[PDB]
């Protein structure tokens, strides 16, 4: 589990909240977002 | 009905124009508390 999203409309019609935790720190941000219907983190080994 | 019960708070953030009235309420409520306490104590003393 890595965090949360919170809001009123969740579809860029208004402002909404994103919280995310990764291997060393959080980010918290509040933007007029267009979220996806199913949010998740694709966190993979990048060869480059 | 004052901004705080702690008399030092009123004297830390209000001046004589405002601190005076804030203290008056606390005087009016605390004096009544003493009046009630003694009233009960005089009624109990009559029973003892």
């Amino acid at each position: 589990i890595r965090g949360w999203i919170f809001g009123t409309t969740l579809d860029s019609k208004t402002q909404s909240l994103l919280i995310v935790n990764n291997a060393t720190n959080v980010v918290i941000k509040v933007c007029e977002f267009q979220f996806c219907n199913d949010p998740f983190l694709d966190v993979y080994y990048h060869k480059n | 009905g004052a901004i705080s019960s702690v008399l030092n708070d009123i004297l830390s953030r209000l001046d004589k124009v405002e601190a005076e009235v804030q203290i008056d309420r606390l005087i009016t409520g605390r004096l009544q508390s003493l009046q009630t306490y003694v009233t009960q104590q005089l009624i109990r003393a009559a029973e003892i």
Partner: protein
């Protein structure tokens, strides 16, 4: 001393922290129009420390400067910017047409009188949608007697006597209830026990 302010529909809140808040520089910077405080006395601001000072910043018309007082009602207090009745802090305001007004008008300070209901305290709404002020569902960019954020005001310099733009900072903060960060310019002593 910012170049421009935020418009009061989208009022800009900046956090003051980890610093010394001497207010003497604020009025030695600019001879204000107002310096009005709630839950504190102006004389005591030097003797105290504030847990979290917060500067709301916006521009407001001279006829509406007093509408920033707690619990009052009227368009800006009903839809754009509201402080709660238990407001702690101070409101500073000053005239700004000398820096902030244009001979034709400064049509950049959009402000809204069109909302579904009175706004909540310390809330900011940027939803510039065609509000249904008409008796029918106004849809598309416009509709019957329906409008989004009013198209600002005629901020023209020699025109608006007591009615031109004023610059406003609402310092909102609480103190003596939690660890206080920003403090006054008083300097500490050695500690005795």
């Amino acid at each position: 001393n910012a170049t421009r302010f935020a418009s009061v529909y989208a009022w800009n809140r900046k956090r003051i922290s980890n610093c010394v808040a001497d207010y003497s520089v604020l009025y030695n910077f600019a001879p204000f129009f107002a310096f009005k405080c709630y839950g504190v006395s102006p004389t005591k601001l030097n003797d105290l420390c504030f847990t979290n000072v917060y500067a709301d910043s916006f521009v407001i018309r001279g006829n509406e400067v007093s509408q920033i007082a707690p619990g009052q009602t009227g368009n800006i207090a009903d839809y754009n910017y509201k402080l709660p009745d238990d407001f702690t802090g101070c409101v500073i305001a000053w005239n700004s047409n000398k820096l902030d007004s244009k001979v034709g008008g400064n049509y950049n300070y959009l402000y809204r009188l069109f909302r579904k209901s009175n706004l909540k305290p310390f809330e900011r709404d940027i939803s510039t949608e065609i509000y249904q002020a008409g008796n029918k569902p106004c849809n598309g960019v416009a509709g019957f007697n329906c409008y989004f954020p009013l198209r600002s005001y005629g901020f023209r310099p020699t025109y608006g006597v007591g009615h031109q733009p004023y610059r406003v900072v609402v310092l909102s903060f609480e103190l003596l209830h939690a660890p206080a960060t920003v403090c006054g310019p008083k300097k500490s002593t050695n500690l005795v026990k």
